Amino acid sequence: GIQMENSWTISKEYHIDEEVGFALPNPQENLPDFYNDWMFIAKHLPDLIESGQLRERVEKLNMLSIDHLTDHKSQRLARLVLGCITMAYVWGKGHGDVRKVLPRNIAVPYCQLSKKLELPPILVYADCVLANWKKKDPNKPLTYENMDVLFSFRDGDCSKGFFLVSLLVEIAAASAIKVIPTVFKAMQMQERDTLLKALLEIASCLEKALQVFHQIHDHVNPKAFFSVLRIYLSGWKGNPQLSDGLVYEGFWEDPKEFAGGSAGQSSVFQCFDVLLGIQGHAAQFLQDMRRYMPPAHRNFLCSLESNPSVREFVLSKGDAGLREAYDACVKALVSLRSYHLQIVTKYILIPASQ
């Protein structure tokens, strides 16, 4: 099922890092000088939006060809830059004054880069979290204190807390993802202890991931998230403010609908749903958000689905330790889902009631 680079490590074609998992390892922070005008706007989005200067600034940009973005990391940075500018341009200050046409000198390079990466031309999780970070000190570990985001939308939008805590959850889960190949090898070799320890390691990492997730409350304010950050994560699919979608000037003639952010864009949920065998209007939206994940990660999720069932192997062994380790994994994953639902309630549904 899962293609392997060697006897120990999954194929590099899945673009999954041993240390940070689905996150992009050591993201590029600076683009070639050729793109300084894009970088300036993105680096100054807070003060450009607040001063009402962002849209005029974007409308004065020249056309910059994407031909000089010659590797994956520079293209991912550029997608993040152009995606943040796009959200800022469409929604503005978030009072209802929206733009229905994205200017061509952003829309064309953005859409071509999106085609290259096979991502939709709208900000997604893989941009604003998985690639939107850096280490303050390269010699220190991956901790909140030692990390920052590359871009925010508004001063006080809590985007650092929201994005970095999400990223640290993904990094915690990375230590579980790297055990997945060991789980399937242990099943094939009928290695009881190897499988038990793999399942206990996955459980322990997902439990840690929930403890990292708990940090969200200390770095994100519900009012600022609901009334500010949520705006720039909103899309134009089923949105009455952009009922037909957005016109990408110079790329498509007709407006096009693309969805805003969703927790379904994290590959962590489907990865361990499938691994543990615990995976329709909801099924259609689920599958759609899969298409908002990096294509290599979709392919990893598919290969996982092609393997034998961990759950049926474990429950056939009359083995309490194996079943308890399996159950600990399920419990951990359910607790992450349950916590996501709590965050949706405290940071969206409640603020909306008010």
Ligand X SMILES: C#Cc1ccc(NC(=O)OC[C@]23CN(S(=O)(=O)c4ccc(C(C)(C)C)cc4)C[C@H]2C[C@H]2C[C@@H]3C2(C)C)cc1
To ligand X, the closest distance from the beta carbon of 162 in angstroms equals 7
Cα–Cα distance for residue pair 16/178, rounded to 1 Å: 9
CB of 331 to ligand X, least distance (A): 15
Scanning 70-78, 122-130, 191-199, 249-257 for contacts with ligand X by CB under 6 A, the matching segment is 122-130
CB of 41 to ligand X, least distance (A): 18
**265 lies in the binding site for ligand X (CB under 6 A):** yes
Closest Cα partner for 316 from 274, 277, 279, 271?
Answer: 277
Q: What mask of x and - would describe binding to ligand X in positions 190 to 219, judged by CB under 6 A?
A: -----------------------x--x---
Give the containing element (helix H, strand E) for 101: strand 101-102
**In this complex, which beta carbon is closest to ligand X, that of residue 138 or of residue 240?**
240
Q: Please select the residue that binds ligand X; options are 39, 108, 329, 336, rule is CB under 6 A.
A: 336
Q: How many CB atoms lie within 10 A of CB 278?
A: 12
Which residue in 2, 98, 117, 263 binds ligand X (CB under 6 A)?
263
Residue 166 touches ligand X, criterion: CB under 6 A: yes
How far is CA 104 from each of CA 86, 107, 114, 174, rounded to the nearest angstrom?
Answer: 11, 5, 14, 38
Position 344 contacts ligand X (CB under 6 A): yes
CA distance 90 to 93: 9
Binding status of residue 128 toward ligand X by CB under 6 A: yes
Stretch that binds ligand X, among 147-155, 261-269, 296-304, 318-326 (CB under 6 A): 261-269
Query: Which of residues 328, 340, 346, 351 is near ligand X by CB under 6 A?
Result: 340
Backbone interruptions in the chain following residues (C to N > 2.5 Å): 279
63 binds ligand X (CB under 6 A): no
Q: How far apart are the first and last CA of the chain?
A: 49
Strand partners, 242: none
Residue with tokens 């889960």: 173
- Going by C-alpha positions, the residue among 126, 82, 97 that lies closest to residue 251 is 82
Of 219-248, which residues contact ligand X (CB under 6 A)?
230, 233
Question: Torsion angle of alpha carbons 168, 172, 173, 174, nearest 10°?
Answer: 100
Annotated binding site: 340
Residues of this chain that bind ligand X (CB under 6 A):
123-125, 128-129, 166, 169-170, 213, 216, 230, 233, 261-263, 265-266, 268-269, 336, 340, 343-344
